[PDB]
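Teaching note: in complex prediction, the entire set of molecules is handled at once rather than each chain in isolation. The prompt given to students was simply: 'Predict the structure of this complex.' The entities are:
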Amino acid sequence: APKVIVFISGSCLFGAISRSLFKKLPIPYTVVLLILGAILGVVASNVPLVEEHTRDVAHMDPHVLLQIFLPVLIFESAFAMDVHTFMRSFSQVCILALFGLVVASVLTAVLAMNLFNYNWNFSEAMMFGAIMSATDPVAVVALLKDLGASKQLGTIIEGESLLNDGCAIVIFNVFMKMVFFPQLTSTVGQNVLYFLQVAVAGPLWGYAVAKVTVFFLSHIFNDALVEITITLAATYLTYYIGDIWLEVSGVLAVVVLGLIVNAEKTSISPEVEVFLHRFWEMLAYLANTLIFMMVGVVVTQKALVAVDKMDWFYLIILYLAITIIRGMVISLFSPILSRIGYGLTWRNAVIMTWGGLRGAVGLALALVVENLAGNDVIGSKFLFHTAGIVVLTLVINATTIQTLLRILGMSDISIPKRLAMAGAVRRIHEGQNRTLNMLKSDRFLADADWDIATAACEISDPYSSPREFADMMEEARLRMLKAEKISYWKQFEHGMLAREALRLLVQHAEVAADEKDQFILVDDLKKSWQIKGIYPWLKRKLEDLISTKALIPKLILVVNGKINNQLSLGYDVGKGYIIGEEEVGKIIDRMVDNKKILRELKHISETGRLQVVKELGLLQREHPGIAVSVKTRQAIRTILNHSRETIHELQGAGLLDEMEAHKLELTVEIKMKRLMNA
Amino acid sequence: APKVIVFISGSCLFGAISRSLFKKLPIPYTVVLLILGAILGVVASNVPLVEEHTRDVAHMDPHVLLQIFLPVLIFESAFAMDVHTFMRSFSQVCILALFGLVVASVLTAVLAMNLFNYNWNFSEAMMFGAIMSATDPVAVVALLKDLGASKQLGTIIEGESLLNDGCAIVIFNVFMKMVFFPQLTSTVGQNVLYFLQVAVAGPLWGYAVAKVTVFFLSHIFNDALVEITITLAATYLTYYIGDIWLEVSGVLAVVVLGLIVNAEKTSISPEVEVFLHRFWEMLAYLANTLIFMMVGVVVTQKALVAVDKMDWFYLIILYLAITIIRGMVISLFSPILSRIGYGLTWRNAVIMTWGGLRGAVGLALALVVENLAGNDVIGSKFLFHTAGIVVLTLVINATTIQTLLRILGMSDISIPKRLAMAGAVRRIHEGQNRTLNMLKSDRFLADADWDIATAACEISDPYSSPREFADMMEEARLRMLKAEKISYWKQFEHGMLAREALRLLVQHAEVAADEKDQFILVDDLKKSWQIKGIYPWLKRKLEDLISTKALIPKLILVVNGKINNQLSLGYDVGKGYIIGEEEVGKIIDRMVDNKKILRELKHISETGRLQVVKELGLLQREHPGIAVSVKTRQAIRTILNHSRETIHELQGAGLLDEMEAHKLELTVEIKMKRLMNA
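The expected output is the structure of the full assembly:
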């Protein structure tokens, strides 16, 4: 009889109860799970029958704990984030995560050595700093997401969470092998070799397995189970092979694998995409629930017996000091981040300072130190301080982050977004009235009383002079920008443009939304039509190389394919821009009040129109075959989407049965996936 | 380091390879998994490093093998079934599964004792027959749904498979405790009490946990991970508590739990249902892959050293005998099923004899016999014979089942189905012709080569006188039934008809299509009206009872709610018939060639309409609040579906963003879930 399935299933049930019963209370479910784990710990100490069930998950081996629960958490943090906004701000988030984690770790280490009375050397103190500097802010990311703007703040916090967790487990493994398995003694050159091995072979092994698995997923059609199975087995094989068979940092490998698989979303079928997002979220929730329950049980059983009043005072001063250290790190890196084109405002800086909530990664590394220490008190005090900072950060920072967003004035709903939603909900009310009027006149449902119906289906609002000429200009700017975004979504809705091209189009739209007095420019788009880079230089060198020798033309084919795919996306974004300008120029002529600013806005729009058609004419001149190819790809998308609409219409008229409709749907879906991998 | 992870992920990747490479070939992927497991077994027998990774999975404990891999297989078999068509024909699958399994087990036991040279008692031979007679034909069900008609035959075989697996593990567990753990010496009364304990408290404990789980699922809103977690934890907790903490037959508990959760699809949110179906299919696929790879490794490491040519001859004779035994069982129960309202023909009898493929359940029971036996020869012989029966049934029967379908003439395509699908594909062809014309007239794609576009967007068809007065009467019956189906599907997709109402209506369409002369009569609709049964008798007892005293109104609420659900189903099916009859009265008067035949159809249609109106009036006078309750639920459904379509219109028009449309979609889906309980 397995003793682990009762604990795993009971943990799932208790996390379900904690999510259900505290979803309106401001504290998260994780602090409730830690409390329930503590109660389970004292009842395990009292009653031996509960001890026999909690023993085999309380005494989890550290290696199996890492190798099971780190890949799922790290892969869900990689998969869940938008990789496009992550790479659009990769430099700032990379320098922030890497340099901020190493300086926050070294400052927490020197604080631990100078202030804690427990005589720790620099290796154990750096282990402590690596644990305390690993952050998992899912809650701050979600709350910044639902409160409208500062979306780039949410992407920045999520990306620095992912990279911070990765390099924190890297430096944790380095100092753990320094201090707990101290048998290795080596020269300077072997240390350079080991650092090079981890720091370079991590992303390289992740890239290798990611390219292999994306090539495998691109060719698999009409079986979803193989796709989910391939992602799961690829993740666990990447981490296990990298950590054990090699000495490669497997954490960075699963980070890179997750980011690459998230980037090539087109290789996976979309129903499997929706499944994979919810599947890795479920595995995330399972891992967090189990890790928090394990932390509670072992922090009651083996860590609280060495607790002193000086230890509690050290916990309070450690919370204050680690918050101050993270804030100061953001403060010193703020000028260097201001050198980057997206500078941190002081509001976003204090949000990132407060938004660091310690999580299951730090708790798991504390559990590893605790189980590997054994009789030594260092593991117990490690576990106590990590669990205390997790509890304190969850309680204080998660209950005060919404209040701080109100205090900063970042949480206010923008007034035009309020008005558009008010018009939408009034139109929903109007449609409800129309359906009530048509539904009163039926030969059956006329007996149905409309009092309870109107009481049920009501959607309330969740929200509830040259200077004046300049304000009018800013209003016209906002109206033209929102009309352009509306046109881009309309171009998406008919299948005119690709999703990947529409992402770049709305990204240029959001860039123009960031600038106050700058309209949608032409040079920023022109840089996207520009083919210049390292790749055309290598193309010229390969054209010189025309005049492993059999493997060279495969490489020139790969380089040429990358070039023509990039300029195909350029042609698509060009077509989108001119179509959007044409639709806006049709639309906006009837609704601008002032003729002078109407002439001004049409002047800048017409100059942009002439410039984009000039650039597209030059691009079609440069290489006509890939222009013909992107026209054919647009043709295939439009025909197959209208055929999908046709089979849905024939199902709706009922003339075709549902199972043969699914057969035709799978035929057109197989054809669409064949188009997406050309 | 966990060595289970490399074998689990390697088996997952091998199953991915075997499915992707062997979809076109007629042999299943499972025989390729068995052969690759054998190759890995002999490699591990030579090379010690491969043994170091396969030892912890080949020498798995049998109890943990059952407690992990049986709940997922049994729950996926239960959830994958159609509960309506299973319970509509529950008597035949129940009698066939129960009596056929005990008869096949007794006959295979006496066959093992009489044939095999090694001395087995009746208990071990009964264990052998229990392993042999458990069947898992997912291939036959998939092909029979794929090959058009005999949907009812596929539901019969699926239900027989599920109940066969459940009762086979029940008889296997009681004889396993008889042989390998014969510590108990029991009285006749204790034996009667224990038989009552398994065969009664299995489904009862499953029903209790299923009602609690359904009630908890019906109240969790806005969150999906809690629902998926609740289903997974409920399954594993139900099996673990029933098998270990009680002596309850826990396989039937998982059977009843899966059948009830499959019945209450309305309690789960609609996206979670699609996720849960694919999730449990994935888990059963991983379980099948691991079970087959494990049985390959252990049959190469342990069973093949104890084989003989006499054993191979015994295996061939055993395969022929198990096929003959299944034929004799279903042939002797054929008159009893002829007394049941749906009877098996000789074609369906031979497709059910040949279609039984032995699989993962039997292989798991072979694995636990092999592990429980130890050094004795009985476990090795068990493993060899079960592996041989599985590989022979796969290789022979799963490859010959399609040509048996062709020979029996059930694989052919129906002529109205073929004509309707040809009309569907010509509608697709003319629609893509008109979109090619609209795609040729645009100044942007004006240079697009339409030849490759046309050549890539082609969807092929996958199938590819008074006597004459009687013949046109028959074809007019077919056309009228087709138009009734057309109106019923139009009522469903307009949002006015319930899904189970459409299932009953197409059941009525098939009943009227069974005999060509008879129309859709009113008597089945009367049986839908006539609520009278044990529950209205209980309602009369409640009327006696109103004249635990606080719990009594809760009981009358429960019985009244059951009656209200039955009234909702009856009102839905009758409203569907009268609306479809009105629509078909609008329709029929054009395509009928003979005026007297037209009036002949119209008279019986009008009398059916009048009868349904009279019965609806009787129901309206019978119960005051229930008719307006069902009418209000239809009103809420119509206005909420129109609100959903309005929010999709606003999102497509771009006046509402994706995040806000997600918010309002969440609001209206929460409102629909609140409508699900009233």
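Point out the following to students. The CA atoms of residues 89 and 342 of chain A lie 8 Å apart. Chain A has four domains: 4-408, 412-440, 466-622, 636-676.
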